């Protein structure tokens, strides 16, 4: 069979349009030549156009290099997910570039194109090869175009000499299409299909936003490859199936804005941090100033046992969740898969093997003010002991000891955010919050009966509530059901215990049925991912109600309150209230999928580290301690009374 | 550029092989023609070969059908991961079918195949293309082949019209190179190449053994191909550099036999849950016997709050693992990954959205045997009780909780286990145990000291070693250290505590201190995989252990046992000796990769429906119902001595 295909091989032109008719006896060749000069990349772009009556009887093309061989058929086929096809008459592709070094000097390349066909009678196609001018990217500039899922693209980026690290930032004004932005190494060939884009690099689905960081050490030769790719079907990116258009002739074409720019210096990691510890160190410093003037001025002038039991819980709770995100980084790390984690990539500044490095630095408040609140107690206790030689330290041991294990777990959830972890955190506070609460009417025992037996089935109903939201899942009017339930179980609840504890009386009982009403509203308003949390806020918060009213019942002139009760509880109203503002900025979501999370980040607002997030972290913590304070000084100047006043 | 094919296509003819030289100026095309039969299916198969010295300029194939085209270059260039390539001298491939049914009639083919190359001198390539006789594969019919990493197979099979599950088994005689088995639906093209195998159908990464059950109704048409395709590398598999023969020219051939067999029908499943059930309904029946018994007979002639904590511990700590395996198994059934759960796949039974139906209907015994206990336990309290108006009923209702959560914990762990889920179940029998000492230490009060505060002190080895083992895995001389640490804190932890409480105590001294060396023997023969379930192995042995030196102690003449302590405890002996024989017999295991895991695996033996792991549970969950027994009905001649005997 010896064929020359120089004898039909027609010297073609670059940036001109060839027409043509090919069937079963006909078969064209074009034969492209040009050259390739060093510290030079050139990249080479194949286009072809067919009409649709070709069903049955594609227009099969086929590339030929040196040293690689590329085909496909004209209009392409994609198979849909519920038994739908689709065909896209217009194909593009790039060609693997081949660097050239001063060492080897300028190359001559040579490529043959071949289109062929069996239509009985014939079948027409436009042909269009082109340079392209814009393929290397340039640092903080940003770039625009278009893409199609029968049209891939792929650029290339060199890393700057003094650049260590850079985060690519890719951009579209509208979602639906759907695609996936992929990082890849430079030795060819290039996965630029559906069926093999996530296979080498690092790549993330999106809709509106994307973000990928990238550090220079695991790059050979300083440059990388970065391919976007657009799906036939919005169903893994949260959508439904084909939206068709006006203009769809077939095609999703998508606009694509892409940015790269270098990362931060390690001088903000360094400030940052002790930013972090200082802050929370002054109060520390400011405690210990407070007692040395005290002693200084005014000076001169059993429950054991129910502290190693939730020492042992504690422990014995947090190792678990410790191990399972350790292994949930570890395969994130090696996987290169970037849906996993519901990280803010805008502001996720890693360190070592850490993705987000300042979201487990903001949880040092946390703990820092559990620790000095159990000192406190634990000064208390001691004072107290050594005067009789205060009934419930107990329960405030237990408060420290949530507050720090509830810094600790929000660490470890921070790790990788998902949809499978933030019950342990949510969960531990039920656990503790019910252990305290029998602890307690034990202690109290019964006497008269006590009260009406209130506790414990509000406890049992929280218990099912829990129960049904794990079984029925956003099912039908059964939201509903539970939602109304849950708020008019609260509403009776505080009902019942405010009753049981006089115009003030049934003035303050319509003030909080009022104040649960707007609760009931507001969740009406926007409906409530997880259960859980929707009720442990609503507790939280009718708590702090409840608080206000004995505040408000003391201040009726039959006690008075020291300085530092009011200090405290004007910085816990401003704090709430700072934190409160924060708590309601979602930068992501595991309630959608992780495009649709992806569309909610934002950039880092605080020394060019912190999001909105740590701040909320940061400002929660102060307002628990401050509340928590409220909460053990309250009772002071009862001690005026002497002969065994309040416990 | 007007090319005839057909002025240089020469008529060529299957199963004959054909040599050739190409260059730039020459190109080789070959035009084969077949027809297909209705109800009969043909596959085409191509094979390619070339030397070594193309490596600058390879060989480029072309294959043209009617609706496809197809292409590759020979050799084959595959990349390593530590910067290695590798080059295959040999391709071969099949053309994707297109089956003719009656009504379309007999179709005829037509094929054209084009070898071309840039080499400036002379290519030399040769060329053999075959139909294949072995396609269809048929029931119960074993089949053997042979893969290469260039060379990737595929085969059809067609659902028989009664069957409505089958089962895959893949099995191999030697593992590395390792490979991938993937089944995925008829419409082409087929992703048969290591870039895309994983895209559509369902797939497993094997070495000797693999196991893929199917049910008809998810396949439209009732038939499936199966692909099998080789790794050019062993490290995704557990392997290291890949192993060259003295023989090799490189290629990893791998010889592989494929059976599918029916899967079993519901009247198992009917037969095996009858008998789950009644093997421990017996148990009720047969109490309730005796107790009629004696009462026809033998008749004619303060811990609320302590069972209410554990409750609530208990609820609140399995809640958040029943979503996490909630959401492992959905994924594990939408992504179609079969590499993330660590079954038996030999014996794994579906039903519904469960992948192993068995190993969870396996733990009936633990929830059942627990709630008989708590049973027996509630009426001796409530006799004690009538009575008066028997101390330690708060610990007994520990322990029927801690079987209930024992069973409950392996169940959720069973439904999709890996290297995430084991430290929940180990985790909290340490709270229990931790939280039952302290309870017991703080009850019986120190008056004289206690003992030694022996049991905090290990305890808390038992902290820091767990957080050891979390800390360094398998790491050199510390493995050693840990090991040799807890070992000896056994020894000398049981030498005071028999101490504390005269030639026999000498003599049960120096027995208990030879156990413990053999336990450390044992260790070091076989590594621990675990450090966390070793150490409650270790602790739950001693403990029966020491149970024995206390009923040999009690048979010294000074005190008699009733019927009811040595039918229990000969019982637990024989029952403890059969559990312990199946313990042994491990068929997965999460410590290597899922190849290996899948190496171990074994069919069941039991009624078609069982493992030896749900006999370990069977065995398990009984012998731990014998030992409480034991151990709570010790001491029952003593009530002979009235006015307050022991309590
Ligand atoms: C019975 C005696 C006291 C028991 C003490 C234990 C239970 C009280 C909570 C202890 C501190 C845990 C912090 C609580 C909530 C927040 O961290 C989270 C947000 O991540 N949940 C949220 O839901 C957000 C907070 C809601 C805010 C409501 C409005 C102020
Ligand atoms: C201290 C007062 C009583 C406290 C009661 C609660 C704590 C004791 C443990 C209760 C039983 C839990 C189940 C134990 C073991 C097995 O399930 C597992 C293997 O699945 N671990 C294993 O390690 C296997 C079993 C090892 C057996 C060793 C040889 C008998
Ligand atoms: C479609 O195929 C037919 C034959 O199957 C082609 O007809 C002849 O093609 C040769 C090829 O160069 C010409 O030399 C003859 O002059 C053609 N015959 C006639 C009567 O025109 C036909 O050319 C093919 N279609 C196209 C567009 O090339
Ligand atoms: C293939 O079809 C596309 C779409 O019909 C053609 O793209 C057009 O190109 C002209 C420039 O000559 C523009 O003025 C039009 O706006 C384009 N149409 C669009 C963007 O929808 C293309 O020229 C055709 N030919 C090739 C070789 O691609
Ligand atoms: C390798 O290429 C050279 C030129 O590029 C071929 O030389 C001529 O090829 C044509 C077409 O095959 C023949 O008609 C001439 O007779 C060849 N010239 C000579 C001096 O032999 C050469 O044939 C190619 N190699 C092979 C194996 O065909
Ligand atoms: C390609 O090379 C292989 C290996 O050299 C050839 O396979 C041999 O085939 C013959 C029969 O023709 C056997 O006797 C040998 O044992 C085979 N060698 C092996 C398996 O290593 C093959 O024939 C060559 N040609 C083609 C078209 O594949
Ligand atoms: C190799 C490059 C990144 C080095 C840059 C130095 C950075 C990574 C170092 C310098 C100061 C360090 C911090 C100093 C103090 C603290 C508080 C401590 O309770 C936890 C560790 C933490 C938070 C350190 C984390 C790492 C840190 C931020
Ligand atoms: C025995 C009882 C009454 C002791 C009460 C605890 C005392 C020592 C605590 C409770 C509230 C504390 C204050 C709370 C907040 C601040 C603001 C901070 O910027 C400096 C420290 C300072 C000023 C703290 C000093 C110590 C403080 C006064
Ligand atoms: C009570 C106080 C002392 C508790 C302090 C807990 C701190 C030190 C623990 C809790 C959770 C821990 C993290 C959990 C998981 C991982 C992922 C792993 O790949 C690197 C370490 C890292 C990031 C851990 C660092 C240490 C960590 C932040
Ligand atoms: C050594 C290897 C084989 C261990 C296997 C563990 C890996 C593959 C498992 C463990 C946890 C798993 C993840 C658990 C939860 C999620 C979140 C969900 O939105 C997508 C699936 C995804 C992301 C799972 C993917 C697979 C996964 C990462
Ligand atoms: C005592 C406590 C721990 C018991 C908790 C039982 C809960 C977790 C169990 C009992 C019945 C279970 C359900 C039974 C059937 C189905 C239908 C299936 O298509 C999805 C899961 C779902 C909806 C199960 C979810 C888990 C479930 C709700
Ligand atoms: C959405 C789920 C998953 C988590 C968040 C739920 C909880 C924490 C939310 C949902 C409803 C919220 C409350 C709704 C209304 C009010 C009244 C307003 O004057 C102060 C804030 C306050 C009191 C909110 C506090 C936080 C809250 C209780
Ligand atoms: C402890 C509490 C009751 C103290 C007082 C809380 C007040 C000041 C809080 C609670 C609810 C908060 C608001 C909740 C929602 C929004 C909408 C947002 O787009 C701007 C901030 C704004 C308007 C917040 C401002 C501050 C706010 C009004
Ligand atoms: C549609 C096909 C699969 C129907 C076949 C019937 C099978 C699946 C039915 C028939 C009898 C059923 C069992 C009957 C009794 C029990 C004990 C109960 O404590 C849990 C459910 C369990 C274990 C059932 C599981 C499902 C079961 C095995
Ligand atoms: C108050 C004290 C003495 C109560 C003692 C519990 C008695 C009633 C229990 C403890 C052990 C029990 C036995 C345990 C196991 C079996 C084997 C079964 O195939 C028949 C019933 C039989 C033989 C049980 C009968 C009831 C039994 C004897
Ligand atoms: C104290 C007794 C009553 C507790 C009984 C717990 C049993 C009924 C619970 C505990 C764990 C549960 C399983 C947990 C997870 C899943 C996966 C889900 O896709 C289907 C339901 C299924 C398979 C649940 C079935 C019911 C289940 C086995
Ligand atoms: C109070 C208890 C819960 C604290 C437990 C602390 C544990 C979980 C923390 C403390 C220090 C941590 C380690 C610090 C550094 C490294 C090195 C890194 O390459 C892998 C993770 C690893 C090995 C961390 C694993 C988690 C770790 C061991
Ligand atoms: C291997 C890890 C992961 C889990 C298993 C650890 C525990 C359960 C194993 C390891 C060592 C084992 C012991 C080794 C030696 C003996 C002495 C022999 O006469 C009876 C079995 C007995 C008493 C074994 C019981 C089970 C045991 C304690
Ligand atoms: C409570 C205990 C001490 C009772 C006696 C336990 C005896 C009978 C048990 C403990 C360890 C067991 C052995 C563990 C492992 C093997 C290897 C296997 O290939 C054959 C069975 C064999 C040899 C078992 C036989 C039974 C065995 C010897
Ligand atoms: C409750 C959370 C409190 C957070 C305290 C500070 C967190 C410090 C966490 C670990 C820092 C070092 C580990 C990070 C990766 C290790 C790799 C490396 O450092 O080289
Ligand atoms: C401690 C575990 C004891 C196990 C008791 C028996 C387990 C029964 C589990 C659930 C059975 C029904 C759910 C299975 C899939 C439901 C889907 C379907 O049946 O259509
Ligand atoms: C490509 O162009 C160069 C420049 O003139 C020429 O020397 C070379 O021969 C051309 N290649 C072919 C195959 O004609
Ligand atoms: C290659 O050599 C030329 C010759 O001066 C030089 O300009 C160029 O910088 C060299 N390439 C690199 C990467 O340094
Ligand atoms: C293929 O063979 C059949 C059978 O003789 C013949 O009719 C047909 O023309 C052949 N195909 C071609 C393209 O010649
Ligand atoms: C098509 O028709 C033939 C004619 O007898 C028959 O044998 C065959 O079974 C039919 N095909 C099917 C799928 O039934
Ligand atoms: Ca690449
Ligand atoms: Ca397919
Ligand atoms: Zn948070
Ligand atoms: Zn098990």
Not at 231 to 256: H, M, T, V, W
Not at 333 to 345: A, E, L, M, R, S
Request: with cysteine; charged share 15%; glycine share 4%.
């Amino acid at each position: 069979p010896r064929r020359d295909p120089f004898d039909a091989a027609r010297g073609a032109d670059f940036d001109h349009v060839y027409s043509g008719v090919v069937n079963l006896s006909t078969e064209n060749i074009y034969s492209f030549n040009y050259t390739s000069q060093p510290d030079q990349v050139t990249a080479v772009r194949v286009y072809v156009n067919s009409s649709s009556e070709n069903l049955n009887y594609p227009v099969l093309v086929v590339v030929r290099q040196q040293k690689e061989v590329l085909s496909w058929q004209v209009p392409l086929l994609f198979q849909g997910l519920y038994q739908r096809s689709y065909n896209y008459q217009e194909v593009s592709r790039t060609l693997c570039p081949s660097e050239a070094t001063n060492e080897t000097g300028p190359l001559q390349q040579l490529i043959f194109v071949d289109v062929a066909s069996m239509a009985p009678l014939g079948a027409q196609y436009k042909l269009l090869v082109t340079k392209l001018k814009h393929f290397q990217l340039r640092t903080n500039v940003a770039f625009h175009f278009t893409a199609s899922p029968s049209q891939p693209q792929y650029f290339l980026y060199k890393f700057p000499k003094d650049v260590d690290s850079v985060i690519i930032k890719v951009v579209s004004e509208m979602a639906y299409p759907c695609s996936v932005v992929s990082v890849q190494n430079i030795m060819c060939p290039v996965y630029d299909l559906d069926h093999n884009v996530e296979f080498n690099g690092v790549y993330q689905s999106m809709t509106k936003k994307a973000a990928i960081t990238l550090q220079k050490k695991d790059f050979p030769g300083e440059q990388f490859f970065v391919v976007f790719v657009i799906k036939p079907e919005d169903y893994a990116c949260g959508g439904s199936f084909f939206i068709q258009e006006k203009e769809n002739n077939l095609q999703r074409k998508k606009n694509l804005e892409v940015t790269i720019v270098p990362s931060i210096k390690e001088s903000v990691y360094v400030k940052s941090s002790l930013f972090s510890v200082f802050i929370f160190l002054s109060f520390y410093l400011g405690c210990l100033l407070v007692g040395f003037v005290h002693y200084l001025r005014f000076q001169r002038k059993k429950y054991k046992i129910y502290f190693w039991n939730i020492i042992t819980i504690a422990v014995f709770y947090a190792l678990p969740v410790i191990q399972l995100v350790i292994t949930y980084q570890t395969v994130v790390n090696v996987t290169g898969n970037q849906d996993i984690c519901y990280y803010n990539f805008l502001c996720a500044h890693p360190l070592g093997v850490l993705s987000a490095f300042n979201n487990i630095l903001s949880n040092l408040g946390h703990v820092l003010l559990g620790f000095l609140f159990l000192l406190i107690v634990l000064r208390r206790d001691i004072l107290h002991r050594r005067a009789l030689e205060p009934k419930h330290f107990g329960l405030f041991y237990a408060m420290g000891i949530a507050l720090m294990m509830e810094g600790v777990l929000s660490a470890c959830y921070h790790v990788c955010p998902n949809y499978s972890n933030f019950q342990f955190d949510t969960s531990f506070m039920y656990m503790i919050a019910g252990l305290c609460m029998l602890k307690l009417y034990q202690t109290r025992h019964p006497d008269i009966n006590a009260s009406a037996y209130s506790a414990y089935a509000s406890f049992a109903v929280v218990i099912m509530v829990t129960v049904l939201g794990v079984v029925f899942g956003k099912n039908d009017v059964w939201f509903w059901v539970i939602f109304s339930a849950i708020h008019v179980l609260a509403s009776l609840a505080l009902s019942t215990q405010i009753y049981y504890m006089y115009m003030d009386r049934m003035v303050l009982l319509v003030v909080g049925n009022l104040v649960n009403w707007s609760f009931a509203l507001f969740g009406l308003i926007y409906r409530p991912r997880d259960f859980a949390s929707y009720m442990l806020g609503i507790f939280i918060c009718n708590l702090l109600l409840y608080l206000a009213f004995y505040i408000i019942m003391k201040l009726r002139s039959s006690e008075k309150v020291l300085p530092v009760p009011l200090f405290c509880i004007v910085a816990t109203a401003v704090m709430w209230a700072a934190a409160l503002y924060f708590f309601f900025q979602n930068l992501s979501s595991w309630e959608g999928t992780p495009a649709e999370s992806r569309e909610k980040n934002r950039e880092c607002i605080l020394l060019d580290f912190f999001d909105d997030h740590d701040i909320w972290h940061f400002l929660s913590a102060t307002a628990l301690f401050f509340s928590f304070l409220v909460l053990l000084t309250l009772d002071d100047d009862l001690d005026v009374v002497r002969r065994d006043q309040i416990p």
